From a paper:
2′,3′-cyclic nucleotide 3′-phosphodiesterase (CNPase) comprises 4% of total myelin protein in the central nervous system (CNS), being the most abundant CNS non-compact myelin protein4. CNPase consists of an N-terminal polynucleotide kinase-like domain10, a catalytic phosphodiesterase domain11, and a membrane-anchored C-terminal tail, which contains a cysteine residue that undergoes isoprenylation. The catalytic domain enables the rapid hydrolysis of nucleoside 2′,3′-cyclic phosphates to nucleoside 2′-phosphates. The CNPase catalytic site, lying in a groove between two lobes, has pseudo two-fold symmetry and contains two apposing His-X-Thr-X (X denotes a hydrophobic residue) motifs, characteristic for 2H phosphoesterases 113537.
In addition to the catalytic His mutants, near-complete catalytic inactivation is evident also in T232A, T311A, F235A, F235L, and Y168A. The inactivation by the T232A and T311A mutations was expected: threonine or serine is found in the catalytic motif in all 2H phosphoesterases, and in CNPcat, they are involved in all stages of catalysis, in achieving the correct substrate binding mode together with His230, His309, and the active-site water network.
Numbering used by the authors: 161 to 208, 213 to 292, 300 to 378
The structure:
């Protein structure tokens, strides 16, 4: 009888760190919704007055927030066994880490936070494109009704791809904690003046 792996590995934020990022995320969806530049380009955000984004991203993580590394599906996913067998993964299991979050973003599908992993933390990132490894690292804050949390990372990569070309353009707003950027196609990004640090434990979720 074999030992099945978790649903996925990842950094799970503490109560206080989750509380902080959660409320910060809420404050962002409230300011963005009330903002002038957003109300203008609302046609490219919804096919259908004001839109309250906190309600729009109705599906939100219930307990503590997290930053996933490798989706394993208890060993069914490709490379799950290989990832879990790594010394660095087994060594890091249950240990605390400090994740740096550089920006919060919003798309028609998801709302999340961009994670900038350290070189130490990148060793825990699966190497199973076009952007540097770990660019997909994120914390999902919310999803639209028929969107799956896996979308959040994909949305982030799409936004970072627009940053490669430099389609970010000039900041279309100054929020209390950073500069607002309009990427188009209902995509928005808040570059934080100060990268907020969150405390999290690297472990495995079984669900
Ligand atoms: Cl903040
Ligand atoms: Cl969808």
């Amino acid at each position: 009888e074999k030992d099945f792996l978790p649903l996925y590995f990842g950094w799970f934020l503490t109560k206080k760190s989750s509380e902080t990022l959660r409320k910060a995320g809420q404050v962002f969806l409230e300011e963005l919704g009330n903002h002038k530049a957003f109300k203008k380009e609302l046609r490219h955000f919804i096919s259908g007055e004001k839109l309250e984004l906190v309600s729009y991203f109705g599906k939100r993580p219930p307990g503590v927030l997290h930053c996933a590394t490798k989706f394993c599906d208890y060993g069914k996913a490709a490379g799950a066994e290989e990832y879990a067998q790594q010394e660095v993964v087994k060594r890091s299991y249950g240990k605390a880490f400090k994740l740096s979050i550089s920006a919060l973003f919003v798309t028609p599908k998801t709302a999340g936070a961009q994670v900038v992993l350290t070189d130490q933390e990148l060793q825990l990132w699966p190497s199973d494109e076009g952007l540097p490894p770990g660019s997909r690292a994120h914390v999902t804050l919310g999803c639209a009704a028929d969107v799956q949390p896996v979308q959040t990372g994909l949305d982030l990569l799409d936004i970072l791809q627009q940053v490669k070309g430099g389609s970010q353009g000039e900041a279309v707003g100054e929020l209390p904690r950073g500069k607002l950027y309009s990427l188009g196609k209902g995509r928005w990004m808040l570059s934080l003046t100060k990268k907020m640090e969150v405390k999290a434990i690297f472990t495995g979720y079984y669900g």
